[PDB]
């Protein structure tokens, strides 16, 4: 059918308007809710619609977060509307449709027994760090960074971060749930039960994605919460007493067998670009404050090729926009802008 609703622009207004869509198709279902694919009647533009059951006498965290965001590497909230079991309310997030995910692309190469071309690893990870730089500048932590939540336009190689259903604006002093993030990408402080963690848990998860892109498989495939730490210890060894305090000050373990870290150069295939391993070693640190900030990660030597005037996608096309930085995005370290924006990128 042609479905017509009254929906509020995600941008603001916020003044409601009639929005019509067709070709409705279920493309996702979970405990979170249902995701549809649809086609807008006046534009023809494809959209995704995320339908979530809403506690009617409460506000939606994901909505409040999504309304604040406007960034080329974050899925755009076009509209939102409510409906409508009798007295049940569903919130509908209308998002720009993006056909692929980093997960499905990486899985393709993985099943073909080959590694994703290094240029894409640079492209996707850099766009990931940008999206993180953006949301962290608001104090918003995603808390569910994984390849499945990274959307890809296969033609343009644009990456958009999605699924803010776990996201939270973190306030220091106010405790946060520890059992969060998909297991393989869960920061070690979370496993140790930290409630005072920071946005740096997203950087850990970003490091896991990077490593996965290099390995063709998850770096830490834990079968459970405890086994997740077992997996981490195989690479990083055991944390020092100081790293434990840094992760969770409320956790104490007076005695445990110390284990040395495995060399990063042996974690990855011999032909893994040494700069990718270097970046990875600065993201997958026990000490949360020792991890690179997303901006610092964007400025890393590994992304040097992206700042090269003559860089092209393997398909001949030019790369997506990479240097359109805003004051908000650069706010954690404003001077880094002269390194991040190379001379050919300026107006």
């Amino acid at each position: 059918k042609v479905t017509t609703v009254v929906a509020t622009p995600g941008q603001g207004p916020d003044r409601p308007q009639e929005v019509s869509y067709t070709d409705t198709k279920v493309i996702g279902n979970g405990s979170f809710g249902v995701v549809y694919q649809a086609k807008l009647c006046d534009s023809g533009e494809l959209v995704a619609i995320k339908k979530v059951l809403q506690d009617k006498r409460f506000k939606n965290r994901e909505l409040q977060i999504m309304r604040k965001l406007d960034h080329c590497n974050i899925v755009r909230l076009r509209y939102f509307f409510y409906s409508s079991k009798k007295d049940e309310v569903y919130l509908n997030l209308v998002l720009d449709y993006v056909p692929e995910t980093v997960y499905r692309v990486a899985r393709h190469y993985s099943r073909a027994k080959q590694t994703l071309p290094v240029i894409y690893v640079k492209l996707y990870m850099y766009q990931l760090f940008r999206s993180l730089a953006y949301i962290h500048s608001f104090g918003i932590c995603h808390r569910d960074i994984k390849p499945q939540n990274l959307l890809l336009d296969p033609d343009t190689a644009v990456l958009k971060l999605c699924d803010f259903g776990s996201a939270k604006q973190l306030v220091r002093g106010e405790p946060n749930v520890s059992y969060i993030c998909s297991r393989y990408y869960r920061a070690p402080e979370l496993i140790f039960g930290a409630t005072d963690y920071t946005s740096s848990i997203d950087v850990w998860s970003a490091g896991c994605v990077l490593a996965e892109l290099l390995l063709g498989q998850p770096i830490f495939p834990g079968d459970s919460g405890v086994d997740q730490l077992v997996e981490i210890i195989k690479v990083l060894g055991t944390p020092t007493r100081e790293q434990i305090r840094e992760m969770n000050p409320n956790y104490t373990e007076f005695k445990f067998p110390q284990i040395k870290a495995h060399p990063w150069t042996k974690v990855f295939r011999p032909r893994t670009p040494p700069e990718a391993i270097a970046l990875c070693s600065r993201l997958l640190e026990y000490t949360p404050t020792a991890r690179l900030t997303p901006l610092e990660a964007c400025a890393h030597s590994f992304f040097d090729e992206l700042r090269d005037p003559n860089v092209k996608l393997p398909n001949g096309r030019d790369t997506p926009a990479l240097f359109n930085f805003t004051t908000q995005e650069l706010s954690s370290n404003p001077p880094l802008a002269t390194i991040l924006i190379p001379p050919h990128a300026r107006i």
Binding site: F192, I233, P257
Partner: peptide, 24 residues
């Protein structure tokens, strides 16, 4: 390791047990 992880964290034996499970 949901109630198990909780126990490990509460009893202060998380690392000790993880190291054991390394197997070792």
């Amino acid at each position: 390791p949901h109630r198990l992880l909780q126990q490990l964290v509460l009893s202060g034996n998380l690392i000790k047990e993880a190291v054991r499970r390394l197997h070792s």
